[model samples]
Target: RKMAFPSGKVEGCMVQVTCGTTTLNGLWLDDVVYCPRHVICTSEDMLNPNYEDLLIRKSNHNFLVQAGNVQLRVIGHSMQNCVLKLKVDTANPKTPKYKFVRIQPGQTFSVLACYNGSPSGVYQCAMRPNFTIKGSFLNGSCGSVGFNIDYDCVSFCYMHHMELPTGVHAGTDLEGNFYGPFVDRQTAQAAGTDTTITVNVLAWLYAAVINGDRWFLNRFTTTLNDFNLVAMKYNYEPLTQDHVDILGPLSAQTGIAVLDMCASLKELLQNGMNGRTILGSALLEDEFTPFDVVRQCS
Candidate 1:
C-alpha cells in the first residue's frame, strides 16, 4: 500500500512510517518516499530579483530666490555613481544656465543655481537613475543653502585642471557648444575658471601668431604645424621662414634656433624635470627632451 501525507514545508523529525506494512503511528517528513519540489533554488525563483524597489534617493530639488542665491542638493542611493544635472531657468532674455555633478552612492551633491540680476525665473533640477560610471552600472535633490546664486561653486566628483598656456580663450556651453572666442591667456585668467573646460594648446598658439601678439615671437620658439601638434604633446615646432619674416632675424651670435628656445627655457624654469629634485621628496621625476631633426653625418 501507499502513504498519504499533508503538504507543507517541514524541517525537524516527527513520528515515522514506511510502505504499508504496519510500520508506525506517524511519519517524519524525511521518511516519506515522495515529495513535491517547491523550494526556491534558481534565479527565476527569487522574489523581485530585478530590484525595481531601488530608487535614485535624493532630497529637496526646488527653492525660493529673493536674495539672489539658490542651492539644490541631490542624493544618489544606488550602489553605482550618477550625474546630477541642475538647471536654472531665468526667462529674463539671458541664456539658461545649468550645472552637472557626479555623486557616488550615499553621497550628496550641492549645486549653485545660475541666475543674474534680480532673479526672474523658476528653477528645476533632476537626476536620472541607471547611469554608467567608468563603463559600469549605477546611477539628485537639494537643500536650503540661503539665497546667493554665486554662493556655491559648481562641484564634480572627479576634477581635472589644465592652465591654458598664455594666449588661448574658449568656453563650452556645458551642452558642448562653443559659446565664446579665443582671447589671450591674460584675459582668460582674468575672466576666471570653470568646472567643465576643454582645450587645444597648439591651436591657441596658431591663433596667437595670426593675431600679432607682442609676445608671439618671444613666447613661442617652435613653429608647430598640425602634424607636430599631434606628435608632440607640449613643445615648439621648428621655426619656419614665416616666423622669421614676422619676428625678424635672430641674433647670429646665439647659435640656438628659435624653436629650440621652448625646450631650453623650460629646462631652466620648470622643476621636477630630471627626477633629481628633493631626492624623491617630490612625485614622478621624469625628464623631458626637446625634439630636433639632424641630418646624417657624412
Candidate 2:
C-alpha cells in the first residue's frame, strides 16, 4: 500500500517529492522546492543609487527569492556605516523562528533569510523581515554594496555556449550561466592562501549540485540553451589580446546589481582575463625551449 501524505501547498504554489539527488553548497536539501520570490519592494535615497532600480533596468528581472537564495545589496562609496538583521518563519504565526542579525552602520552587510532545515512550504517575508540600521551622511558621493542569494543554483547550469573558453580546473558548468573558472592557483592547488570569487551571475547556472548551490543550478541548466565555449589561439601578446576581447564583456558588466558586498577591485579586474591565463598563472608564460634553459652553457 502507498503511504498517504498531507497536501499542503497554497493556491499559488506546489511541491514535488525528492526523486533524485540534490544539494547546495555541500548541504543536502532533499524533497524541497522553495517558493520563488513572491513579493518585492524597493526604495532609494534619490541622490544615492538604489539596487532594485538598477536590477530591473539591467537584468530586466524581479526580485523573486529562492529559499536560502536571496540577493542583498547596499551601495556606498563606503559602507563603513550601517547595521542589519534578518529572519524567516512559516506563516503559521504562532511559534516563530526569528533569523535575527545585527550589523553596524557606516559599514554595511547583507544576509539571506532562507535556511536549509525548513519544511517545503510557502512562507512570506515574515514581519519586520527587512532590517536596516540608523546612519546619516553629509557626503552625497558614494559606491554601493550589493548582495544576492540564489537558491536556484541547483538548477541554473545552462552555459552551453561560452563567450570564452572555461578552464576545467575548477569544473566547468557548475550550474549554467553562473560560472566560476579557476580564478587563481589555490582553488586548483591542494593548498594555498586564496583570494578571489571565481563565479558569475551567469556562471551560477553550472555550479556542482554536491556543492549545495543546486536550486538555481537546475533552473538555468535545464531551461537555458546549451552551448560550448568558443576557441582561441594564444601566444604572448596576441593570445592575451584575444582574451582581452573575450573578457571585455565581463569587465564591463558593472556590479550595479547587489553582489558587490565583498567584490573588491581584483575580483572585477580578473573578469577581464582569459580563464587559462588568469587561473593557471598571474602572467602569460611563453613556452621555453630546453636550449634557452641551458643559460649560456653555464
Candidate 3:
C-alpha cells in the first residue's frame, strides 16, 4: 500500500521492460543495473561522558522497512587510530559497520559492499586518518529495491557544506539552519531555501513507518571531535571478536539486495527488518539463522 510506480520513461533515454533476456544492443539487466560499478552519514545527537540512552527503539510506522528489504550507508572521516565505528540498523540486532576492523587510519573502508551476496540497507563507508586504507572516498546507492551503482564520485557529499551539511544538501533556512540533514522537508533544518534535498514525502512516511519496528543500541555515545566521528548516537559499545565473526558473512551478502530494496521502496529505508534478520542471520548462520545458535552463542 505504499503507492507510486518505480517504472517510467524519462528524458531522451528510453528504457523498456521486456521479457526474455531483457536487453538491447548487447546490454543485459545486470549490465544496465551496474554499468559503471557498485558504489557505494552523520551524527549530532552524539556521545556523552555520562553514557545516556539517547538511542531510540524501533517504532511501528516502518512496517515496510522492518518487513521488507533495505540498505544503509553510514560513512564518516574516521576515528582515532584512524578507525571508524558504525551500527547500521540491519534487523532485530543491528550490525556494526566496522566490526571487522573498527579502527583504521589511512584507509577508506566500506562497511557494505554491493558485490556481496547478502547486501542489506545498512550501507556504510569510511576513511582512516593516515589514509593508509582504501581512501577512494565512499560511492554507492541505497534504497528499497534496485540500486544505482556508481552514481557519484569519491568525495564527501556533505564536504562542501561544513557549518551545516544539511544546509549544503538541502539549502539554508531562517536563523540559517538546514532543512535537510533530517528526512523531513516540512520541518526545515533551519528554514531557508527549499533546496534542502527535499525529503521525499514518501521516504519520510516510510522512515516514520519503520520507526515502529527497530532494533539497535539503546545508548549511542561517542568520544571524539574528528570529522570521521560524528554524533548519530549517544554511547556505542566496542565490537567483540564474536561480533566481528558474526558480521564477517553479513557484509558479504545483502550489499546487492539492499540496493534493490532501498530503490524499490524509494526511501532511506523500506525493507529495513528483512535487512538485519534474514540477511544478517544468513551471514551469522551460527546465530541469527538458528534460534538455538543465537541462544548458545551468547
Candidate 4:
C-alpha cells in the first residue's frame, strides 16, 4: 500500500514507505521540507534578493563567499527584509532642524550644521527598534560643526564618532573643512592675515621645546595643565607630548639633535633640580655643538 502524509505530520521525522514496485532506501519524510537557511532567502528567491538584505549578508561574509556562495547558493536562503534608518535632530536651541537618513550596515553618516554665533543645544540620533544616541553642544562658535554616527548592522548596534569640541574657533571652517584645534589671534598673525593656520598642538609644543622658547613653552605647558584639569573632570586622557624625540631617527641618541632637544632639556632641568652636575658629561658639549654641525647631522 502507498500512503502520503501532510508535510507537518512528517516534518523532520523519518518514515518508511513503498512506491509502486520500487523500494526507496533513504530517509523518507515529507514531500516538501523547509530548511532554515541564511539571511539571503525571500519570496523573490535568488532572482531578486532585497539590496538591504544583500548588504547585511555581505557585511557578515567574506569577499569570496559573497561573490560565490551568496550568488550561487539558492537552496534555503530566505529572510524577511528590513531597512536601516537614522533620524537626526540638529537642535540649534533656536532653530532646530530635523533630518532623516538611509544608511547601510557598517557605514558612517555625518551632517554639517554651521552657525554664525555660539550655538548650544541637545541633539539626538535615533535608530529604529530602540537605538538612541544623545549629544550636546554648548557655546560652540562660528564655522561648521557636525555629528557623525556609524552603524554595525551585523551586531545590530551603533556608535558615535568623536565629538567636535565646543567654544569659539572650533577647529573647522565655514565650508566644512577641518583646519585644526583652537585658532587664536596670535596663531592667525603668525600665519599671516590671508593664510589659515592649522595648528597641531603637539607639534607646536615640540617646536617650542626644540627652539628653547621659554615664553611659549611656559605658556603651552600652563595651557596643557589647564586642559589636564578639565580632562580629569570629564574622564578623558590629558593632552600631552612625550618627553621623547618625536621627529628624530630611532637610532639617534638623546641630546644630540634638534629633534632631541625636548628630551635633552627635560633631562637637564630635572638633573639640575636634583643638584646633579650641569657642566659635567658630554650633554653640554653636544648642546654647544655649532649650529651648522647640528643642521648637517640632522
Candidate 5:
C-alpha cells in the first residue's frame, strides 16, 4: 500500500521526511534527494547521576531519498523549479529562520533540529519535550506534498515496593519517611502511621494498565475486596461508577483501550462475585509470581 504524507505543521519530538518523485516538462524524470539532521546535547541534558530526580530530553529529524507513487510535475520549467520548503520554529529564540531550498537530483541538505521546550510536567518525577516541523512544496502543487511524522508527548513515573513473607516494604510517605521492612503485616499495621501502602500497589495498577499486563489485571480483578482495598486505602472511598468514568478521559489521552477494563472493574465493584471475570484467566489457570525487581525513581 502507498503511504501519503501528513499535511500542515506538526509537533513531535521526532520527525521524518521523504521526497517521492518529480518531472520536467512532460518526458524527463528526476530523482529527489535529502540528508538527515544531527543535533547534539550536553552531558547534564542527557544523563544525571541522581536517579531519584533526573530528567532527559532528546529530539530527532530524519530525511530520506526514497521511491514513492506521488509525483510533482512542472509543465514549462526544468526539474530545478521543483522546491521543498521547510520552516523550523523551535523553543529557542536565538536560532535563525530558514528559507526555501531547491531540490536537486544528487545533492544533499541538512539542518540542526532540537526541542528545547519545558518538560511535560505530567508525572511527578518524569517528563518529555515537544518539537515542531513544517514543510510544503514551494513552487508548485499538483496533487499533494506532505511529510511523514511520528510523535509522543506523554510522561509517566513508576514506583516500586516489595512484599516479603516477614514484612512489607510499605514504601515512603509524602514527607519522605520510609516505612517498614519491619517484621510482618500485623506488626506494620500496629505502627499507627498510614504507611502509604496503597501508593506502591496503585503504581503497579497503573503499570498493569499501561503495559497491558493481563496476568496482573486478572489477579487484581479476581476478588472484590482486593479492588475495594486499593480504593479505600488510597482515597478512603469505595470504587464507584463516578470513579469508573475518570478512566474514560485518561483512555482517550493515552490511546489505550482501558474503557473495557474500566467497565470490567465497574462490574466487579457493583456485582461482586456475581460479575463474570473479564480480565484474568478462565480457560487455563496459570500460577506465576509477580515481581517488581526494577525501580525507576525518575
Candidate 6:
C-alpha cells in the first residue's frame, strides 16, 4: 500500500507508486508528481496512470485560420490547478491578455482569439507548452488537443513555431534560392491568409527580348514546352472532377473551404502566365465549419 499525507502539496517533484501490478507513475492524491515533460497537472492524471498518454501525444500544434473572433476549445477533461501558457499576437499591438480557467472534467475551456479586423494578410498563431498542475508542484504537457488559428499575424515566429500550410507559402530562405511563384488559396486562407494570383507574361517576355537573356529563355522555354496546345482536357492529370464536385458541399457542411486547392493551380499551368502573386483576402468576419467527406456522388 502507498501512503502520503492528504495535506502535503507536491510541487516540481517526481513520484512513483506501485502495489503488486498497480502502479501510479506520477501521483497527486495529496502530493505533486512529475511526468517526463514540464509542469502542468490534471486531476485525472493523479487517478489514471494511463491518462498521461493523451497529454503526451498533443503538445504543440497549428491550424488554418480565418478572420473573426475564434474560439479555442481547450481541455476536454476536468483539469484543475493547471497553468495556461500560450503565444498570442493579434492585429492590434495591444491585444487583451487571457488566462486559463479551472475546467471541470469534460467541460471545454474556450480561449477566444481575435484577429486584426482587416479582411486579409499574412497573420500567424503558434503554441507549444508544458503545464503545472498544483500551484507549483506537478508538471506535464497536453495530448489530443491543438490550435489551428487565423493567419492574421505571426506569433513566436521563430524556433519550433507551427503553421497549417500545405506547401509553398512563400519562396526562398537564408541563401535566396527561388521557388514557384506558386500560390495556394485554400491552404493559405485556411491558415488565416489569402492567396492572390496575377498574370504578367508581357513583362517577362519583354525582359527576355530586351536582355537577350539565356536564363529567361530557359525558364520560359521549360514552361512553354511543358504542355499540349489543342487538347480539350489538360495534358497532365490534376484534381479529379469528383473531388472538385464535393468542394461546394463540403464547404456547406464543414464550415470549411480552401483558397488555393484548385482553380488557381489550373490558371497557372494552362495559361501562358509568367508569374503569380499571392496576397491575403479581406473577409474580416468570415469563418466556416469544416467537414470531411468520406464518400460522394451517389
Name the top TM-score candidate.
5
lDDT of 1 by residue, 162-218 (tens): 123332222222222222232212223332332110011222222223333223234
lDDT of 3 by residue, 1-298 (tens): 1221111111001111111221111001111211110000112222111111211221221111111133322221112111111222322222111111122221121222211222222222222121111212222211111111222311111110112233222211111222233321223233232211111211222232233422421222222232112111211122233433443333233222222222332222212334454222321111011111222222
lDDT score, residue 149, model 2? 18
**Considering TM-score, where higher is better, how would the candidates rank from best to worst?**
5, 1, 6, 4, 3, 2
Clashing pairs in model 5?
none
Q: Model 1: residues >4 Å from true position, as ranges? A: 1-55, 59-83, 87-92, 96-257, 266-298
Q: What is the C-alpha lDDT of each candidate?
A: 0.22, 0.20, 0.20, 0.24, 0.24, 0.22
In angstroms, the error of model 3 at 100 is 4.9
TM-score: model 1 vs. ground truth: 0.19
**What TM value does model 4 have?**
0.18
Predicted structure 2: lDDT: 0.20
RMSD of each: 28.0, 23.5, 24.5, 26.2, 21.5, 21.1
- Candidate 5: list runs displaced more than 4 Å: 1-167, 171-176, 179-266, 273-276, 281-298
Report the poorest 10 consecutive residues by lDDT, candidate 1. 289-298
Give me the runs in candidate 6 sitting further than 4 Å from their true place: 1-242, 249-264, 267-298
Looking at model 3, how many pairs of residues clash? Answer: 79
Candidate 3's displacement at residue 217, Å, is 51
How many steric overlaps does candidate 6 have? 48
In model 3, the runs with Cα more than 4 Å from the true position are: 1-63, 66-100, 108-126, 130-298
